[PDB]
Amino acid sequence: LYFQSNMNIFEMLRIDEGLRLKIYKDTYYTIGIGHLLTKSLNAAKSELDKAIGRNTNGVITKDEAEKLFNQDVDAAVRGILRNAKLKPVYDSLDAVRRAALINMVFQMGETGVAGFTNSLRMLQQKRWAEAAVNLAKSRWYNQTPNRTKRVITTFATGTWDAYKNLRKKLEQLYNRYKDPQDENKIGIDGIQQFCDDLALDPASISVLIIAWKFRAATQCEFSKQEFMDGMTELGCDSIEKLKAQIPKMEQELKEPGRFKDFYQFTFNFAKNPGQKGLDLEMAIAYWNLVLNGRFKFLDLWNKFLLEHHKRSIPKDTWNLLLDFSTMIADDMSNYDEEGAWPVLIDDFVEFARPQI
Ligand SMILES: *CC(C)C(=O)NC[C@@H](NC(=O)[C@H](Cc1nc2ccc(C(C)C)cc2s1)NC(=O)CC)C1CCCCC1
């Protein structure tokens, strides 16, 4: 198995497709770099466990994801060779250009790549410039403009320059924010610098929207992995490019489905690692940021919690408050006293009703 050509392909597709260490929901059960497990979560974990050779519980290491990737590369290579429209192109290409073709197969399947009849012809004929121009005219160039440009450059040059240069630009940028006492992460100072460079306050909602798009785990913490993967997925190689992405992130929250996802992420981001709940003071601080102009009883809710609850906020209570905020009438007349709401919200309605 180890005799086959080589593994710059793993990092190439880690940049283009991304690496997920936990079982993710695909448009179904997927892990690593696009590795399909089945078509029940118990069956997905069963397939993953048998493939890895341990009880993973849905979480794998980078090396474990690399092993699944190599199996997917080999499967793709076999498929390409069994395809009459792809094999003559594949056989004729060098190791680097073969990797760019496998990348296309990973993204749209063999049928989709086969559709580029005129472009494949130019590639087989070693007309690199003509193929680079023709592949840019395609719709594939608009779906993934960052990925497509990288793949086109790989076919045009026969080098890893597009991926090397992006990693170099991001690595130099990372050096400005990294902690002097720890290279693998961005400290308090670095986070402040990053926010300063974006001309935003670190406690602002815009920074919280960024954290949501970066899928950052904890507030006041920012790892090299989060920075590298976040910037690449957002198609940004500089602070200016990330700054220009903020209006689109804002517009996305005007859709309720995306707002629910962002609101629920805020709980996970705001909490202290090792704690299941969110401290009252921290919850109120984040509620005033995410529910500002969405919940009429927000201040009365805060006043109620500081005077009557004085305790931690669980995940379910956090999630359910968004549902309460959107259904509740201005006079609270539509509130169901025996309608599944947590005790805390029942007590809030009882406390708030005499104050109209
Ligand atoms: C001790 C400490 C850092 C602190 O003051 N924590 C509470 C306040 N939190 C913030 O100001 C955080 C700081 C940030 N953490 C990260 C982590 C990752 C990123 C990347 C770029 C995505 C960015 C930031 S900024 N800010 C936020 O959580 C955004 C609202 C603060 C006090 C009360 C108001 C909210 C929390």
With CA atoms as reference, report the closest residue to 44 among 26, 62, 70: 26
**Catalytic residue chosen out of the listed positions 16, 17, 226, 237:** 17
For residue 20, give every residue at least 6 positions away whose Cβ sits within 8 Å of its Cβ, in sequence order, or none: 30, 31, 32, 33
207 Cβ below 6 A of ligand 1? yes
With CA atoms as reference, report the closest residue to 219 among 293, 289, 166, 156: 289
Residue showing tokens 């283009």:
16
Nearest protein Cα to ligand 1, atom 1: 220
CB 155 within 8 A of CB 128: yes
DSSP string, 217-275: SSTT-EEHHHHHHHHHHTT-SSHHHHHHHHHHHHHHTTSHHHHHHHHHHHHHHHSPTT-
Resolution given for this structure, in angstroms: 2.4
Pairing of strands 35-36, 20-25: unpaired
Nearest protein Cα to ligand 1, atom 21: 211
327/295 Cα distance (integer angstroms): 10
167/232 Cα distance (integer angstroms): 9
Per the DSSP assignment, residues forming a β-bridge with 343 are: none
20/13 Cα distance (integer angstroms): 12
Per the DSSP assignment, residues forming a β-bridge with 35 are: 31
DSSP string, 111-123: HHHHT-HHHHHHH
Q: How far apart are the first and last CA of the chain?
A: 74
- Tokens read off for 343: 């005790």
336 belongs to the catalytic site: no
Q: Which CATH architecture has domain 8-162?
A: Orthogonal Bundle (1.10)
Q: Hey, which of 196, 219, 221 would you mutate to test ligand 1's pocket, going by the most ligand atoms within 8 Å of its Cβ?
A: 219
Nearest protein Cα to ligand 1, atom 11: 203
Q: Hey, which of 207, 280, 287, 288 would you mutate to test ligand 1's pocket, going by the most ligand atoms within 8 Å of its Cβ?
A: 207
Which method, experimentally, gave rise to this model? Answer: X-ray
197 belongs to the catalytic site: no
Which amino acid does the sequence have at 272? N
Numbers of helices and strands, H then E, in the chain:
19, 6
22/91 Cα distance (integer angstroms): 36
With CA atoms as reference, report the closest residue to 305 among 290, 329, 323, 288: 288
The SS3 assignment for 249 reads helix
For residue 184, give every residue at least 6 positions away whose Cβ sits within 8 Å of its Cβ, in sequence order, or none: 223, 224
Which amino acid does the sequence have at 262? F
Nearest protein Cα to ligand 1, atom 14: 220
- Tokens read off for 212: 């949501």
46/56 Cα distance (integer angstroms): 9
